[model samples]
Target: VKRFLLISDSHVPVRMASLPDEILNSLKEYDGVIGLGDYVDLDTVILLEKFSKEFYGVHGNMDYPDVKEHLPFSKVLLVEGVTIGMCHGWGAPWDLKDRLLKVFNEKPQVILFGHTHEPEDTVKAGVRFLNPGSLAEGSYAVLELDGGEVRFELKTL
Candidate 1:
């Protein structure tokens, strides 16, 4: 069984003082954490790492040079036979999903992306895509993958 927290588009102190207490406190319940980007603070990354056993992140347009160096534009992880794609996204909000979908060279069972800060969960062309929205706005997601079965929920701070 694998459970993870999915978060995105936190502009940091610029958008909000800190990650909501709810999200911070919920960290222990998850086995891993995946950040969708716009972190804007290296400390935020460190803080997330401190709480979760495993962490994966991608750089957003607002990420600084150091962050860009530390993370990638996109990432793919295979867990419990599920192929997951991660990206921060780009372009207009309406086109964001398809734009991200085009980035993956290989098809993924699930794609987690962010940019618009608007939450979304839908299937397009047989692929499940999830946008956890913006942690700055106090929203996020939880995903459980068990034996090829998947369950997901979106939560608010």
Candidate 2:
């Protein structure tokens, strides 16, 4: 069994959000962490680059162009044979879905993205699209992958 922590839409100004202590503590247990987007302008690179843990993420549309200097538009992460896609949306909800599905065709079993800052989860075309919401407003996800099954727990603080 593998536990992964997915967080998104933290609009902190230079890593200055009052993150819940529990959430911060739980992060240490995750095998890997995924930041969806909207961390805060191009400063995201400067702030995120300081984390001791390695994280995989995509640049949000609001993210400054400087983001391209370090990150890509999207990233597909393969863990234990499960493929997870990451990106920030820049269109209507429906359009975002179609685009993501078409672009990363690994039959992405799971996806993590942020932009709306509104948490959502749905099984579309047999794939799970999850937005852990915005930690700035209190939202996060703890995903468990056991064998071929996936389970999720959302929290707000």
Candidate 3:
């Protein structure tokens, strides 16, 4: 089983001070962590890596140069043979889908992104898209892929 904690728009120290103990504590239970961006601080990425066994991140518009240096604007990560697309998104929320489709040349089975600070879990264009809301706001999602099936649970504070 491959399990991951999904989060985005954690405008840390700028929008909020730190992640909750609940979030930090849950890291070990997951196989990896996926963040969409708006990290705002390199410390954010560092802290996440320290807690989780593996972390995949993409810099958001709000991230600093240090963060951009560590991550990228978009990435394609694989888990148990599943291709996952990651991005922070840009422009209007309504334009998000179009923008995302354009970002990846070979569409992935799942796409994860952040920027709207709103949670999304739906299938569009034959791909499943997910967002864990904003970590700063205490919302996130737990996703699991087992036997080629996907399951998830949403947590909102």
Model 2 poorest 10 in a row by lDDT? 43-52
User: Candidate 3: TM-score?
Assistant: 0.79
- Candidate 2 TM-score, C-alpha based: 0.73
CA lDDT of every candidate: 0.71, 0.66, 0.71
User: Mind giving the per-residue lDDT tens digits that candidate 3 earns over 13-112?
Assistant: 6756677667767888877777764456677667777788577777766547788766787888877677888877555555666677777778888777
Report the C-alpha lDDT of model 1 over 54-79, residue by residue, as the tens digit.
67777765647666665687888887
**lDDT score for candidate 2 against the true structure:** 0.66
Candidate 3 achieves a global lDDT of: 0.71
Clashing pairs for model 1 are none
Alpha-carbon runs more than 4 Å astray in model 1 = 92-102, 116-118
Angstrom error at residue 31, model 2: 3.0
TM-scores vs. true structure, each candidate: 0.79, 0.73, 0.79
Query: Of the pair 2 and 3, which is ahead by TM-score?
Result: 3
